[PDB]
Every structure is written in structure tokens, then in C-alpha cells.
Design a protein around this ligand. Structure first.
Ligand SMILES: CC(C)CCC[C@@H](C)[C@H]1CC[C@H]2[C@@H]3CC=C4C[C@@H](O)CC[C@]4(C)[C@H]3CC[C@]12C
Lengths: 27, 36, 43, 113, 106, 118, 29, 123
């Protein structure tokens, strides 16, 4: 059942993309 | 019947590791152009 | 029965191998796009 | 043996495929599809092909004191490259494809200005 | 003095007559009989050294049985062309990352 | 020296006799007349293939000859796969080439649309 | 085989980054 | 007391009798004389060793013995029973070894980035 291990990689790969960008609006 | 699946599952990890390294440089290089 | 064992595993491993190779090719095309703008603008 | 005198010994513990020539003669000579692939000595009357995962194919023959023997066609299909199209993997393929192109499009939007 | 290892369907067994003098290796599981010893499944690769002594056929003759199984189960083959590609590309990608960091700092 | 042509798709395996044919061409699998299972014309069809009990030697004896006056025997070993396809060099190349073009064209569309609007 | 659940190694080893960037964003805002 | 020494690499198996090293040793396998026959160099006698090229599991696997020549043959009391699967470029791997390489890979990358980061600050 390693499709979940592929599923959550995607959902949290783009969560770092948005978070890192917001670091420079407020700095 | 075989164990040659093991190397294939080991090579998949290498491809996933390289993807993160390529994601970093693309993000990094776009910032320099924007923060000119 | 023992039909599940390793045969079910190798079908998904092949799928991911060619899926993740395609995403790696998409990064090279962006790198060529960005490296031209950087070279021209910074001379 | 009625002039069908080359056999295959399969179902080995390992993946090798071995061929046996059914005769009795010194200086055993082995063909492969109308051409030679090498000489042989005695006491070792088996010719080695390789693992079944490389699925060897072709026509083979064995020589002897008598005339030309009859060929045998070997056809192996061990997948080792199978991909499932069960409407669930193609769903995961399209989802990962559309998301990646959408993300790159946002970046090119900012690059222009 | 051959001591005939009886290999079961998926198991390893040792057959003798006189009581074993344990030395080292896999302890194993004893069955209902003395000197008939189970060494576990073939997949685990049992190893070790076990001793014995004479029988009715042969009297007072020491022996030594060393068991060595190498049925690789988590077995991994190697492809030199594949491992070369991963290392070569990893070296390149590290240099690009270092070049990018230098652009900001310098 | 015409070989047998084998067409496998899913779990149905079809192999072709053409070389001998013209009267009825019988078949013999492990010294038993095959007679689910397909026949007719110069090919044979196996509907729901199973690896372990269906494999071995085949021959195509035309009308009355004992199945020994042939020119060669066929040995096959194939494991089936349901809703299943295999990747060769041609298939891996076409998906790669198409993938590069479709993203490149779309990505360069945004650059000019962004530049035109701005 | 070795173990199918070794793909969890790559996942969490980059999840460390996601937690850290949540702290630095919350620290400044 | 001294156990047999066995080394496998690729399709090679090497054994050396540990019983008594003060004299040359002749080897018999399953009640058959081998080694020193000066033919079929796949197996070859060595001063204190024996090499088996192209190891085969089905044959070539049983009770191996060692004994010094001059002593009467089967007085030796050291019999080794081994059964091995040998394949080319095969290896044994586990969960710990793969994780060690993963962590080492980030260490060399992470160190290099921080080095150039601080080194470029000299100016
Ligand atoms: C390869 C992928 C990650 C590239 C495209 C992803 C998009 C969503 C990301 C990746 C790079 C990101 C940029 C990186 C840094 C900055 C600094 C900020 O002050 C301006 C926006 C900008 C420029 C970000 C906007 C969002 C951005 C363009």
C-alpha cells in the first residue's frame, strides 16, 4: 500500500512552495 | 520468483531524491531574477 | 493463494519509474528557459 | 528420435535455459539460425543461453556424425516491463501531469514582469 | 563419519545418534527426539558448528558438522550502467545548487 | 524457415501456423490433440491463458501425416497480465518526445500572453 | 524483498523543512 | 575447533582448510578426489586454498573435506555441508545500509552549500 506514500508527497511538496514564497512578502 | 524487483525499488528512491534537488535550483534561480 | 507476492509489487514500481522520469525532464526545459534570461539580463 | 533431436531443460532453480543435443559424437558443433556460434568439446553436452528475464529467441541446431539435424524455435515472454492500465493508474498519471504544468504556468506569469 | 543433514520441505534438520556437544551458531528448536534438531527455515540461512559421537554402526568416532546456508532472500543484483548514471547526475546537480547559492551571497 | 507468429494481448494468446496449411492442419500440445480454445483457419486461439498448465511443445501437422514429419517444434513460456501492456523502445520514445513538446508550447504561450498584456 | 515501506524515508526527511518554515513565518508576522 | 573459511564474490567460492596448516592439503568432495589434477582449471589447487570458478548449486555442493597428504585419507574429522545460491553481481542488502547512504548524501550536500555560503562572505 505505498500509493499513499506517493499521495502525501504531492500534497506536502506544494505546501512548501506556498510557504517559502510567503516568507518574502513579510520580509 | 525473482529478486530483481529490489533494485528497481531502490532506483525509484534515487529518482525521487533528484527531483527535490532540481526543484531547489529552479526555485532558487527564479528568485535572483525577481530580486534583481 | 500466493499470487499476490512480488508480482503485484513490480507492476506499481514500473509505473512510478516512468512517471517520475517525465517530471525530471520538465525541470530541464525550465532550466534552459531561466538560464537564458539570467545570462542576457546580467550580461 | 525421429529427427527432432535438440531439447530444452527448463524449470531450473535459477533462470538459466539449457539445450541438450541427443546423439553421440566427438567434436560437437552448435548452430544458431543457419550459422555457427562456436565449436564444443565432449563431457559437456549442454549449451547455455542465459536467464529467462532476457527472453532469448531464435532457431538452433546441433551437429553430429550424421547429417544436418532439425532446428527448434524458442519463444520466451517474461514480462519484466508490464504496466497496468486499470483506470486507477491513469487517473494518477493525469493528476500529476496537470498539476505540474499548472504550477510552472504561475512562475512564467511572474517572470514576464 | 557422514552426519546426514535432512533438509525438509522448508526446513533444515540434523540427524545423529549420540547427544550433541553444542559449540556455536544457531541454537535451533528441539523436536521430540534427542539428536534430531531443527535449524529453522531455509530463508533465514542457518549457520554454525555442531558435534556428535559414535553409533551402533561405528563406535567411538568423533565428527564435526559445519552448516553454511546462503540462500539470499533480500537479494539485490547490481547494474553498473544504472549506478553510474545516478552518481554522475548527482555530482552535476550539487554544483548547480552551489552556483545558485554563490550568486546570492557574492 | 518461416517461424510461428504469436500475438498476445491481455490474457488471450493467438499463434499462427502459416507455412504448411491448406487442408486442416492439426495441433499437438505435449502429445495431445488440442482440438475457450480457438481453432479454424491457420491459427489457434487460447482465451483465458494460464502459465503453469498451458506451455510446452506445439506442432502443425496438415491432414494425415503423423505429427513427426515436421521441420521444427515450438517451445513457449509466457506469463499473462490482465489489462496490461509492456514498454519497448518505441513506446518509451514517443511519450518522451510528445511530453517535451506539449509543455514547451504551453509554457511559451504564457510568456507572450503575459508580455502582450503587460 | 527488502521492505516496501522505505519510501517513507524521503517523505519525512523533507517534511522537516516544512515545519521549520512554518516557525520562521510565524516568528516574523 | 576452527571453523571453515568461505568467501563468495560474483561466481567464485574459495575455501581454506583451517585444521592444520603445517603441510599441503589435498581435498576430497563427497568421496571423490579433486584438486591438483592439473586439468579443468575451473578448480585449482593452491598452497592452502581451493578455488571453484562458476559455482553450480545442484552439483558441487556437499561434504567437503581437508587432509594432509601422507596421512591416511579420511582420518580427518572436519566435514562441511554448504548450500549456496550464487549469481553474478548479486549482493545482500537491508534497511540500515540504504539509510546510511541517504543520510551521508545530505551531509555532503549540506556541508558544501554552507561552506560556500560563509566563504563568499569574506568580501
Ligand atoms: C519549479 C517551480 C517551483 C517554479 C514555479 C513555481 C512558482 C509557484 C514559484 C517558484 C519560484 C517562486 C518565486 C521564488 C521567489 C520569489 C520572491 C518573491 O519576492 C517574488 C516572487 C518569487 C519569484 C516567487 C513566486 C512564486 C514562484 C514563482
Amino acid at each position: 500500500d505505498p500509493k499513499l506514500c506517493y499521495l502525501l508527497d504531492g500534497i506536502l511538496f506544494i505546501y512548501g512552495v506556498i510557504l517559502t514564497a510567503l516568507f518574502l512578502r513579510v520580509k | 520468483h525473482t529478486e530483481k524487483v529490489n533494485m528497481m525499488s531502490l532506483t525509484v528512491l534515487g529518482l525521487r531524491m533528484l527531483f527535490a534537488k532540481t526543484v531547489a535550483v529552479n526555485f532558487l534561480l527564479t528568485a535572483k531574477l525577481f530580486f534583481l | 493463494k500466493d499470487a499476490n507476492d512480488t508480482l503485484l509489487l513490480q507492476l506499481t514500481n514500473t509505473s512510478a519509474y516512468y512517471t517520475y522520469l517525465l517530471l525530471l525532464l520538465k525541470s530541464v526545459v525550465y532550466f534552459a528557459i531561466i538560464t537564458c534570461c539570467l545570462l542576457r539580463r546580467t550580461a | 528420435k525421429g529427427n527432432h533431436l535438440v531439447k530444452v531443460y527448463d524449470y531450473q532453480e535459477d533462470g538459466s535455459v539449457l539445450l541438450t543435443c541427443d546423439a553421440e559424437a566427438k567434436n560437437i558443433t552448435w548452430f544458431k539460425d543457419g550459422k555457427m556460434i562456436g565449436f564444443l568439446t565432449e563431457d559437456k553436452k549442454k549449451w547455455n543461453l542465459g536467464s529467462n528475464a532476457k527472453d532469448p529467441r531464435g532457431m538452433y541446431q546441433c551437429k553430429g556424425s550424421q547429417n544436418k539435424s532439425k532446428p527448434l524455435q524458442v519463444y520466451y515472454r517474461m514480462c519484466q516491463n508490464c504496466i497496468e492500465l486499470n483506470a486507477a493508474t491513469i487517473s494518477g498519471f493525469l493528476f500529476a501531469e496537470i498539476v505540474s504544468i499548472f504550477v510552472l504556468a504561475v512562475g512564467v506569469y511572474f517572470i514576464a514582469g | 563419519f557422514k552426519i546426514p543433514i535432512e533438509e525438509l520441505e522448508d526446513r533444515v534438520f540434523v540427524n545423529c545418534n549420540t547427544s550433541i556437544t553444542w559449540v556455536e551458531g544457531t541454537v535451533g528448536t528441539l523436536l521430540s527426539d534427542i539428536t534430531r534438531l531443527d535449524l529453522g527455515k531455509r530463508i533465514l540461512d542457518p549457520r554454525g558448528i555442531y558435534r556428535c559421537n559414535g553409533t551402533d554402526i561405528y563406535k567411538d568416532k568423533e565428527s564435526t558438522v559445519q552448516v553454511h546456508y546462503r540462500m539470499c532472500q533480500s537479494c539485490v543484483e547490481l547494474d553498473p550502467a544504472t549506478v553510474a548514471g545516478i552518481i554522475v547526475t548527482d555530482v552535476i546537480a550539487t554544483l548547480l545548487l552551489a552556483l545558485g547559492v554563490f550568486c546570492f551571497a557574492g | 524457415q518461416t517461424p510461428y507468429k504469436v500475438s498476445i494481448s491481455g490474457t488471450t494468446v493467438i499463434l499462427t501456423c502459416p507455412q504448411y496449411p491448406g487442408s486442416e492442419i492439426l495441433w499437438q500440445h505435449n502429445d495431445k490433440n488440442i482440438g475457450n480454445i480457438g481453432s479454424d483457419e491457420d491459427h489457434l486461439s487460447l482465451k483465458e491463458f494460464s502459465e503453469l498448465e498451458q506451455s510446452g511443445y506445439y506442432v502443425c501437422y496438415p491432414r494425415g501425416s503423423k505429427p513427426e514429419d515436421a521441420n521444427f517444434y515450438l517451445y513457449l513460456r509466457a506469463r499473462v497480465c490482465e489489462n496490461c501492456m509492456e514498454m519497448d523502445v518505441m513506446s518509451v520514445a514517443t511519450i518522451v518526445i510528445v511530453d517535451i513538446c506539449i509543455t514547451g508550447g504551453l509554457l511559451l504561450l504564457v510568456y507572450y500572453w503575459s508580455k502582450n498584456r503587460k
